[PDB]
Design a protein around this ligand. Structure first.
Ligand SMILES: NC(=O)c1ccc[n+]([C@@H]2O[C@H](COP(=O)([O-])OP(=O)(O)OC[C@H]3O[C@@H](n4cnc5c(N)ncnc54)[C@H](OP(=O)(O)O)[C@@H]3O)[C@@H](O)[C@H]2O)c1
Ligand SMILES: NC(=O)c1ccc[n+]([C@@H]2O[C@H](COP(=O)([O-])OP(=O)(O)OC[C@H]3O[C@@H](n4cnc5c(N)ncnc54)[C@H](OP(=O)(O)O)[C@@H]3O)[C@@H](O)[C@H]2O)c1
Lengths: 398, 398
């Protein structure tokens, strides 16, 4: 099978690498990005790791014509969007125009606004069912695997899921004074926004990082976990019936939160451009220029991550709570694919969803066709693939 | 008398304003800067304040020819350099070429290095004694008035000054999350440098803000005061004989020191340029673009400043300690000249040194001619002018 991937990110290095480790399903992996230096480093690395060999071909994913051009040049079974969420619509359109299969790991987001919303991508459901294709939205860890965990609970453990708390802890040490999980422009747009959660029909808003619980993360410890809006809550509230409260929490250190409140104070997190010696510059972009980009840090990053879902509900007129979670070692990820645990936990699920599609395990024939979030699909084989590809989960009743 | 001033800074607004308030000595004040918007706001303000009327004429002080051109266009008695320390040599040269009188408020500093040193300006002593002119170096508050305080002590209170501690506290509240005394590019270059002090012949270095005493500032309170190198120590160690220890301390809040350590961590205090989307940008300059420039903040700044000199010594084989200091109110400064207390405490002394020169009170005939620091001149009339222009001092023995 043949598949084209857009993005040579920290995440991008993982998805490609993971495809090369499953050469039995991925014979033709073509890798496409704005800057080719990244793509050759991935290419050259995989060959050093023993993982076969990939096509590098530059393209500016913002221009739909050049994608259409690249898609039909290799006519692939699926295209993986692991570039920035801006390119979601431009790549998703070039998939429709070439009747090809699309998966991303992130919502749509416009550079001139810090809004998260599926409805721009969801609009393609008529157009996609029609062109008899599939677009699987948000197939990272969160969103994606967390949806799968909730999906998986809904089938196997719960009659009705009353509450959902997604909990994301990154207890890694990148050994630098201040650095980010992934691309700083998108990460820091996300976390500094007014957090948001669903309870009893209406959505509630909070000032950024207003709410905070302490949570005990298996294999780590007790950590301050702050409340955030996250993409998956949009799809999951719509798709999981019964839901009374749905929240997302993330751990941040004091040191991280301080740097972030300082940079915010001087204007370094600004999305609107500002003139400096003639030139018009966006601060938060310049922050990304200045900061080490994260791939660099996997070499010396140590720690583990824990991400998962804490659900309360009812099964056979009796109460039960479930915790599904995945722990992941930064050093172990480095030594497998040269990346750290955030690149890792995101790329592997996307490579899995690719495998689902190529295997027709997830199919537009033998289901409705069109645009779907992960919790809508058959998750059973997806979860089994996650185990096989390095994201084993725990499952815990109380 | 006629005098030309280069700089429409926060400081610049004070020096011009203060000259207009002494119209009996300043009949022709011409004001020269890179951007004319500042100069008209000063012009238009003085007229609103009742202070007469000034000439605005743009010039790029980096190009010595255009200065020579501006100097001879109005042939003035003195030129006041209140632009950035980079223009020190270019303006100081155009003074020699036109045989005119020069005063600045800051050392020489090259944009590609964070070094403070008088020797680049001191080199002009032969050339200046020859052209029978005068260059008074560092005639702000610190440096400048503090030199005068030490000078004044040396004559009137001490036989030999064993120790000198200069103490600078700014207890103002500019009502913003983070902002700077003066131009952020120069301020933040200064404070984040390895501090330095003189004791027993050799100079000692310390990591930035390594050393810290608590000091009780009259009319304020007890404040954490951190040790810094400051320009005046260079000239004063050379010029005041007897000196066993000479230090400079400045107060910084935790909040300020945190912002500064964060910005330092991400690279926002960098003097070397760095490529971003083609363009090559200096971070710390961009920081200055981003931050409110300080003049803006005088409108709502409240608090007081205390700056002065704590000296121990011997007079008539008996020990004595002297504290000379000046307290200054941010709101009171706003309402007088529209500026805050740092702009104020710096501009007034420069306007005074101008008055000394125009009055021939400080003269190249009836003294050596050439290049001098403030402690080298007759300070008695200078101090009296400071009192008259709003910088009264206290003098305290123990
Ligand atoms: N759901 C999850 O679990 C999760 C967690 C983290 C991140 N994510 C998502 O994953 C992506 C981040 O991956 P990353 O963090 O690795 O980003 P990255 O490190 O910045 O690398 C991104 C890649 O995309 C390329 N790119 C961006 N826009 C492009 C365009 N218009 N045309 C061509 N190439 C383009 C960049 O080119 P340069 O080489 O010139 O930069 C780079 O190679 C984002 O979409 C983020 O929202 C999801
Ligand atoms: N010793 C003390 O007591 C003390 C305390 C504070 C500051 N200082 C010194 O005083 C000066 C700071 O005044 P500030 O803080 O008011 O600076 P500012 O607010 O940045 O304004 C500086 C002025 O200088 C102009 N300028 C700079 N380089 C120029 C050039 N090459 N040609 C023409 N105009 C030029 C700027 O033009 P734009 O309008 O385009 O910026 C601006 O009008 C610095 O020299 C600083 O070291 C001394």
């Amino acid at each position: 099978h043949t598949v084209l991937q857009i993005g040579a990110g920290g995440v991008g290095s993982v998805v490609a690498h993971k495809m090369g480790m499953n050469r039995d399903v991925f014979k033709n992996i073509i890798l496409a990005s704005r800057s080719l230096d990244k793509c050759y480093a991935i290419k050259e690395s995989m060959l050093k790791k023993g993982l076969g060999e990939i096509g590098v071909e530059q393209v500016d994913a913002d221009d739909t014509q050049a994608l259409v051009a690249l898609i039909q040049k290799y006519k692939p079974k699926v295209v993986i969007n692991v570039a920035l969420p801006y390119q979601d619509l431009t790549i998703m359109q070039a998939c429709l125009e070439t009747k090809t299969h699309y998966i991303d790991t992130a919502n749509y987001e416009h550079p001139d606004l810090a809004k998260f919303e599926y409805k721009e991508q969801w609009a393609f459901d008529r157009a996609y069912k029609e062109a008899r294709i599939l677009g699987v939205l948000g197939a990272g860890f969160d969103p994606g695997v967390t949806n799968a965990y909730v999906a998986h609970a809904q089938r196997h453990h719960f009659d009705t899921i009353h509450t959902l708390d997604i909990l994301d802890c990154n207890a890694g040490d990148h050994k630098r004074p201040f650095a980010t999980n992934f691309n700083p422009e998108i990460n820091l747009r996300e976390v500094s926004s007014k957090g948001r959660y669903y309870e009893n029909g209406k959505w509630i808003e909070t000032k950024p990082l207003e709410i905070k619980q302490v949570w005990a993360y298996p294999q780590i410890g007790e950590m301050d976990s702050y409340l955030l809006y996250h993409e998956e809550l949009e799809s999951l509230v719509k798709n999981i019936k019964g839901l009374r409260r749905a929240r997302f929490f993330m751990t941040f250190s004091q040191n991280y939160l301080t740097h972030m409140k300082c940079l915010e104070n001087v204007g370094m997190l600004g999305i609107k451009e500002i003139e400096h010696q003639g030139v018009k510059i966006v601060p938060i972009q310049f922050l990304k220029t200045l900061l080490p980009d994260p791939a660099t840090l996997a070499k010396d990053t140590t720690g583990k991550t824990n991400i998962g879902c804490y659900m309360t509900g009812i099964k056979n007129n009796q109460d039960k709570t479930l915790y599904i979670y995945n722990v992941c070692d930064h050093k172990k990820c480095y030594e497998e694919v040269g990346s750290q645990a955030i690149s890792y936990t995101t790329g592997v699920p996307a490579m899995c969803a690719a495998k689902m599609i190529c295997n027709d395990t997830w199919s537009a024939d033998h289901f409705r066709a069109g645009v779907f979030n992960i919790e809508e699909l058959n998750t059973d084989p997806f979860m089994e693939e996650l185990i096989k590809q390095g994201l084993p989960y725990e499952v815990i009743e109380r």
